[PDB]
Amino acid sequence: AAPTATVTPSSGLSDGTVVKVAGAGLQAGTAYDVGQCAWVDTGVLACNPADFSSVTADANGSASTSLTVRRSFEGFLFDGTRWGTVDCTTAACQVGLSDAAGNGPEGVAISFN
Amino acid sequence: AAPTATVTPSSGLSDGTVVKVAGAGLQAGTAYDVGQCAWVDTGVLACNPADFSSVTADANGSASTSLTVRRSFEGFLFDGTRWGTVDCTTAACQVGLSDAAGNGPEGVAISFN
Numbered sequence: 001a002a003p004t005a006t007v008t009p010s011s012g013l014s015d016g017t018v019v020k021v022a023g024a025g026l027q028a029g030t031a032y033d034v035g036q037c038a039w040v041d042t043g044v045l046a047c048n049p050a051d052f053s054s055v056t057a058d059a060n061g062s063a064s065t066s067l068t069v070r071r072s073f074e075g076f077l078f079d080g081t082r083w084g085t086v087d088c089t090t091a092a093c094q095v096g097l098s099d100a101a102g103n104g105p106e107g108v109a110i111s112f113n
Numbered sequence: 114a115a116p117t118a119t120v121t122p123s124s125g126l127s128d129g130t131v132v133k134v135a136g137a138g139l140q141a142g143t144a145y146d147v148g149q150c151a152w153v154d155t156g157v158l159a160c161n162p163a164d165f166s167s168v169t170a171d172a173n174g175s176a177s178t179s180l181t182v183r184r185s186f187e188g189f190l191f192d193g194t195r196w197g198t199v200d201c202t203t204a205a206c207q208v209g210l211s212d213a214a215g216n217g218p219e220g221v222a223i224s225f226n
C-alpha cells in the first residue's frame with residue numbers, strides 16, 4: 001500500500017497561499033520535510049527550501065502540516081546550490097513530503113491562478 | 114521518490130514464468146515480501162505464499178529478485194485462511210512488494226493467457 005499525500009487546495013493558488021498537506025502510509029516515528037519542488041531536468045529536482053515545513057509521522061504512518069506556496073521561486077538543488085528560478089505557471093510544480101533518503105509519497109501537482 | 118515496483122515480463126505469461134521484480138524508493142535495510150496476489154473482495158487480497166520471496170532493500174533503497182508466477186494458485190487471505198483457487202486469467206492478479214507494516218509500492222498488474 002503506497003504512501004499518499006493530499007494538498008488542499010492544489011489548484012488556482014495565489015502566490016502566498018497557505019495550503020494544508022497530509023501524508024499517510026509514511027514510516028511511523030520518522031521526520032519528513034514538506035515542500036514545493038519541480039523537476040527541472042532529468043533526475044534534477046529544484047525546490048523552494050525557504051518555505052519548507054516538516055512533520056513526524058505518528059504511529060499510524062500519518063502526519064499533517066501547512067505550507068506557503070510561491071508562484072515562482074529561486075530553485076535550489078539537494079546540495080544547497082541554486083539551479084535557476086522556477087516559474088510554476090510554465091513549469092509543473094508539486095508539493096510533497098520527503099524523508100532524509102528522498103522517500104515519501106508521490107508529489108502532488110499544483111497550479112496557480 | 115514514491116516507491117516503485119516494475120515486473121518484467123508482465124503479460125503473455127504462463128504458469129511457472131519467472132519474472133524480475135525491481136523495487137526502488139524503498140526503505141534501506143527493510144525486508145520486503147515479494148509475491149503475487151489477487152483482489153477478491155473490496156479491500157481483500159488473496160495471495161500465493163507458496164511462491165513468495167524476500168528482499169532486503171540496499172543502502173540506495175533498491176531491491177531486485179525473481180518471482181515464479183502462477184496462472185492459478187490457492188489464494189490465502191492475510192491471516193492464512195484459504196479463500197479458494199484464484200484463476201488469474203479471470204481474476205485481477207498483481208505482483209508487488211510490502212514490508213511488515215504493509216507499506217510499499219503499488220502492485221503491478223500481470224496477465225497470462
Ligand SMILES: CN[C@H]1[C@@H](O[C@@H]2/C3=C/C#C[C@H]4O[C@@]4([C@H]4COC(=O)O4)C#CC3=C[C@H]2OC(=O)c2c(O)ccc3c(C)cc(OC)cc23)O[C@H](C)[C@H](O)[C@@H]1O
Binds near residue numbers: 033048095101107115
Ligand atoms: C535525498 N536526495 C535526493 C532528493 O532530494 C530532494 C530535494 C531536492 C532539493 C532541493 C533543495 O531544497 C532543498 C534544500 C537542501 O539544500 C538546499 O539548499 O535546500 C531540499 C531537499 C530535497 C529533499 C528531497 O525531496 C524529494 O525527494 C522529493 C521527491 O523525490 C519528489 C517530490 C518532492 C516534492 C514535491 C517536495 C519535496 O519536499 C521537500 C520533496 C520531494 O531528490 C533529488 C532528485 C536527488 O535524488 C537527491 O539526491
